[PDB]
Design an enzyme around this catalytic site. Structure first.
Site, mmCIF file in Angstrom:
data_model
loop_
_atom_site.group_PDB
_atom_site.id
_atom_site.type_symbol
_atom_site.label_atom_id
_atom_site.label_comp_id
_atom_site.label_asym_id
_atom_site.label_seq_id
_atom_site.Cartn_x
_atom_site.Cartn_y
_atom_site.Cartn_z
ATOM 1 N N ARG A 98 -2.262 -12.322 -0.667
ATOM 2 C CA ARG A 98 -0.826 -13.234 -0.774
ATOM 3 C C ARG A 98 -1.178 -14.651 -0.373
ATOM 4 N NH1 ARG A 98 1.839 -8.389 2.145
ATOM 5 N NH2 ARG A 98 2.992 -7.303 0.324
ATOM 6 N N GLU A 111 -2.499 -8.989 2.463
ATOM 7 C CA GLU A 111 -2.130 -10.127 3.013
ATOM 8 C C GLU A 111 -3.042 -11.164 2.565
ATOM 9 O OE1 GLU A 111 1.055 -10.421 3.840
ATOM 10 O OE2 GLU A 111 1.351 -8.613 5.239
ATOM 11 N N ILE A 152 0.889 -1.142 0.106
ATOM 12 C CA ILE A 152 0.077 0.162 -0.037
ATOM 13 C C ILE A 152 0.942 1.439 0.026
ATOM 14 C CG2 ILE A 152 -1.663 1.381 1.205
ATOM 15 C CD1 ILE A 152 -2.771 -1.431 2.088
HETATM 16 O O1 LIG Z 1 6.827 -4.550 7.148
HETATM 17 C C1 LIG Z 1 5.319 -4.764 6.419
HETATM 18 C C2 LIG Z 1 5.360 -4.626 4.989
HETATM 19 O O2 LIG Z 1 4.283 -5.703 4.268
HETATM 20 C C3 LIG Z 1 3.065 -5.237 4.268
HETATM 21 O O3 LIG Z 1 2.600 -5.939 3.047
HETATM 22 C C4 LIG Z 1 2.935 -3.921 4.406
HETATM 23 O O4 LIG Z 1 2.267 -3.185 3.324
HETATM 24 C C5 LIG Z 1 4.342 -3.383 4.705
HETATM 25 O O5 LIG Z 1 4.840 -2.668 3.452
#
Ligand SMILES: OC[C@H]1O[C@H](O)[C@H](O)[C@@H]1O
Ligand SMILES: *[C@@H]1O[C@H](CO)[C@@H](O)[C@H](O)[C@H]1NC(C)=O
Length: 246
Positions: free
Chosen positions: A163, A160, A71
């Site tokens: 992913r 998240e 983000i």
């Molecule tokens: O350290 C956390 C990172 O992983 C997550 O995806 C956040 O967007 C961030 O940039």
């Protein structure tokens, strides 16, 4: 662009959002059948906009870097907000330029800075659909301390979840009651980079990881992932960060 509405949202509609989010990230190859995110993308094409609508129908638009699901910032009415980091500053040259003012947030986007700014680790912050609704609502009006907690929610329930299938399922389980992330969830979040790398290095090494990855499983036990037959690789991770970015 992709869109998600909290009004009338259920586990299915959320799942269709997360699928649309995954499908919006470009890849030209797969590695062990998992989409490999691109090394880079130039210009405005680097950034996906996500339109999020709270339960009353107010909206923020969130910019996401397609090469790593990070983000960058968001637009809330006529104000843009960006992380205090050079990737977001670059992103502000392309998205939300129609904002009447641009605020840079007083922190970068990584979890450790966000947790500091929030006053709490994300182990203690409930996630789920109601929490996402709350998060969107918070971000509508600037308050940097409140926004840190909200962004922790937003990142986990969007990027998240895209992913990892497991995290997407956690959130679906929290459609109508928030709950703090399981420790497995936290482990996967923290390991995205390393898993991504090891899955790519396994090609060329007979599916074996160069360096084992340690995860916390669903029962809370600490477990080593050493190869591509593990369920985390075959049935969970949905997107690989390119090793050119690790
Ligand atoms: O350290 C956390 C990172 O992983 C997550 O995806 C956040 O967007 C961030 O940039
Ligand atoms: C691969 O991982 C599985 C469990 O996922 C394990 O049983 C097996 O011993 C591992 N093999 C190698 C060569 O790492």
């Amino acid at each position: 662009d992709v869109s998600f509405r909290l009004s009338g949202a259920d586990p299915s509609s959320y799942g269709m959002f997360i699928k649309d989010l995954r499908n919006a990230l470009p890849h030209t190859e797969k590695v062990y059948n998992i989409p490999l995110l691109l090394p880079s993308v130039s210009g405005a094409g680097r950034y996906l906009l996500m339109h999020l609508f709270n339960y009353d129908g107010n909206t923020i638009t969130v910019a996401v870097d397609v090469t790593n699901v990070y983000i960058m910032g968001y637009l809330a009415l006529t104000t843009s907000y960006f992380f205090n980091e050079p990737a977001a500053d670059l992103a502000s040259q392309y998205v939300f330029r129609s904002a009447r003012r641009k605020i840079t947030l007083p922190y970068s986007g990584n979890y450790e800075r966000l947790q500091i700014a929030a006053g709490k680790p994300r182990e203690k912050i409930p996630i789920g659909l109601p929490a996402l609704d709350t998060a969107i609502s918070t971000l509508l009006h600037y308050d940097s301390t409140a926004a840190a907690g909200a962004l922790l929610v937003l990142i986990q329930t969007t990027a998240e979840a895209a992913r990892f299938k497991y995290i997407e399922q956690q959130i679906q389980e929290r459609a109508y009651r928030d709950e703090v992330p399981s420790s497995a969830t936290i482990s996967l979040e923290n390991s995205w980079s390393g898993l991504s790398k090891q899955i790519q290095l396994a090609q060329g090494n007979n599916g074996v990881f160069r360096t084992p990855t340690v995860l916390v499983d669903s029962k809370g036990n600490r477990v080593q992932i050493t190869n591509v037959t593990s369920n985390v690789v075959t049935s969970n991770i949905q997107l690989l960060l390119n090793t050119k970015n690790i």
